[PDB]
Amino acid sequence: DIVMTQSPSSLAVSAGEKVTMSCKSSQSLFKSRNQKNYLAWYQQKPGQSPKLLIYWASTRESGVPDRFTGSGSGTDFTLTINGVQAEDLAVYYCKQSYNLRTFGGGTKLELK
Amino acid sequence: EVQLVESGGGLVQPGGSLRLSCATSGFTFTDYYMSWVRQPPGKALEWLGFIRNKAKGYTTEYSASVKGRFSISRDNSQSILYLQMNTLRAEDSATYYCARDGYYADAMDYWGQGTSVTVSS
Ligand SMILES: O=C(O)[C@@]1(O)C[C@@H](O)[C@@H](O)[C@@H]([C@H](O)CO)O1
Numbered sequence: 376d377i378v379m380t381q382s383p384s385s386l387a388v389s390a391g392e393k394v395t396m397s398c399k400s401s402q403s404l405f406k407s408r409n410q411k412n413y414l415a416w417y418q419q420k421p422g423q424s425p426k427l428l429i430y431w432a433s434t435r436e437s438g439v440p441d442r443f444t445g446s447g448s449g450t451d452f453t454l455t456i457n458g459v460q461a462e463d464l465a466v467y468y469c470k471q472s473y474n475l476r477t478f479g480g481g482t483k484l485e486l487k
Numbered sequence: 488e489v490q491l492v493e494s495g496g497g498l499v500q501p502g503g504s505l506r507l508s509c510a511t512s513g514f515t516f517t518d519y520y521m522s523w524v525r526q527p528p529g530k531a532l533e534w535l536g537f538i539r540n541k542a543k544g545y546t547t548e549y550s551a552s553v554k555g556r557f558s559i560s561r562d563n564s565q566s567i568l569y570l571q572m573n574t575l576r577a578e579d580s581a582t583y584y585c586a587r588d589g590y591y592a593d594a595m596d597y598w599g600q601g602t603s604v605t606v607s608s
Pocket residue numbers: 413472473474475539543589590592593594
């Protein structure tokens with residue numbers, strides 16, 4: 376079964392800063408056949424409906440601000456928010472969709 | 488405009504069962520898989536299962552954590568998704584979400600507002 380590990384569990388920066396967080400997978404999520412990573416990032420603001428941010432490691436979902444960038448491939452991924460807004464307070468989850476689906480433990484983004 | 492609306496959550500006795508519903512609109516329902524995900528208080532999102540689209544024959548898959556206990560189905564004449572929850576325990580207390588899913592993006596692109604389920608005697 377695929378293990379999805381996110382670091383750190385929690386972090387805080389000030390409005391307007393850049394942050395990055397890590398997501399690692401126990402197994403490569405890339406298929407050579409269609410050149411896709413089966414890895415997506417989600418945002419769940421506290422107490423509400425999650426939202427899709429990024430799919431295929433680096434493709435930003437329609438509607439999502441270009442603040443958000445996903446990068447990496449294989450087993451190693453990161454989400455970068457270039458200029459954090461108050462709206463961004465949330466837990467960010469990476470999720471493998473290579474074999475069924477499994478979410479990581481999340482990284483809670485707090486604001487200072 | 489895509490809409491997904493979960494309903495049917497509430498209080499349930501341990502051991503008991505509940506049926507959650509997810510009514511959909513704004514897209515061709517049968518074209519998509521539908522997934523169920525939950526967030527227990529204080530805990531990470533957890534994918535529970537999906538039911539595939541028409542092209543795949545609407546078959547199902549589950550997390551090890553619920554396989555054999557929960558069952559997913561859909562009524563395509565109503566564009567409605569169901570989660571049949573059985574043999575519930577305290578640890579199944581959570582907010583349950585339905586989400587549109589599939590092999591187009593291998594991602595869950597639209598999510599309902601959630602329904603809350605508390606398992607307590
Ligand atoms: O299990 C599936 O039906 C599915 O097609 C879903 C896709 O999102 C992807 O997980 C795929 C697997 O990579 C197997 O090809 O399976």
